Amino acid sequence: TLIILEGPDCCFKSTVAAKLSKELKYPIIKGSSFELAKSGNEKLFEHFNKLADEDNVIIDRFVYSNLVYAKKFKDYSILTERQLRFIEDKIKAKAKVVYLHADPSVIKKRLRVRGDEYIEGKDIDSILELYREVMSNAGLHTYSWDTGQWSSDEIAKDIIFLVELEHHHHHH
Amino acid sequence: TLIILEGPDCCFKSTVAAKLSKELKYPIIKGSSFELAKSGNEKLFEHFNKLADEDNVIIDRFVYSNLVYAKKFKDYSILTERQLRFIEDKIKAKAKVVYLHADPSVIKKRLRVRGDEYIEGKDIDSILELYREVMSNAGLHTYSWDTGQWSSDEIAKDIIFLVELEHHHHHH
């Protein structure tokens, strides 16, 4: 199974990743490539394509993340709808898209707790509004957990159970 | 005296500001305006112009900061060279431009210590390379402190001494 993790900062994405790795015994890879997302759309698509072949691993931020942070940074490539559906097709059978989020208020609170200085104050709202926009236009099925209601542990357990239950799952 | 603080995160800018305020009895104002830096160049210029009138205060990030973060975020206005020199002219006599920075390696280390997930890994290099680029093209005189060599306390003392010494300072 190719577990994909998406969502904004301060949602324990890295923690949940660690737990899933230790448990499911899957390596961890960071999809998002600020460097490559600048160079060009081609080398960017190639990149995500290489990852689309891997399996039995966890990807911390994939195409969906790029389809979000691209609408924020200058000189930042984005995948075309055709390129997306292409990648989703190659992973449709081995993919578990995970979206970890939290309320805007909660995220700013965690951000303040961490000590940010550039902390906009509303840009988060947009990021969140943007994420659920991208997830809504996904070709694959998506799973989301509110990191404000469930702990990093309870979440990893849910996913762990699904993954091990895939043997009975037929993607059609 | 108008104290203007510029530089990247993780350089104790907010801490140096707190001390300067407690001592010099100057209120603190955050220059940068994400909201207004998006709206438009006009309302943005009107913003800094309004701040260029205040005195005996500390501004956490001002025009120089905008002249940096603008080359990074989409839909982000920037001040024109004429608009900058205009503002620098209005403050040339009452301004102390402070630049707090640190080595790229040190900043990433502090970033890691804080727990960032979007932490590029080289974008900082650009930000720093960009800042010293802007500071170099400044109309006012600038003062910079390496937050990697001097403590937040020693820095605030240096500035505090300068400010109180302005009575003897003639800007020409």
From Swiss-Prot, chains A, B:
GO terms for biological process: dTDP biosynthetic process; dTTP biosynthetic process; dUDP biosynthetic process. It comes from the Bacteria. GO terms for cellular component: cytoplasm; cytosol. GO terms for molecular function: dTMP kinase activity. InterPro entries: P-loop_NTPase (IPR027417). Disulfide bonds: none annotated. This is SPbeta prophage-derived uncharacterized protein YorR. It comes from Bacillus subtilis (strain 168). The gene is yorR.
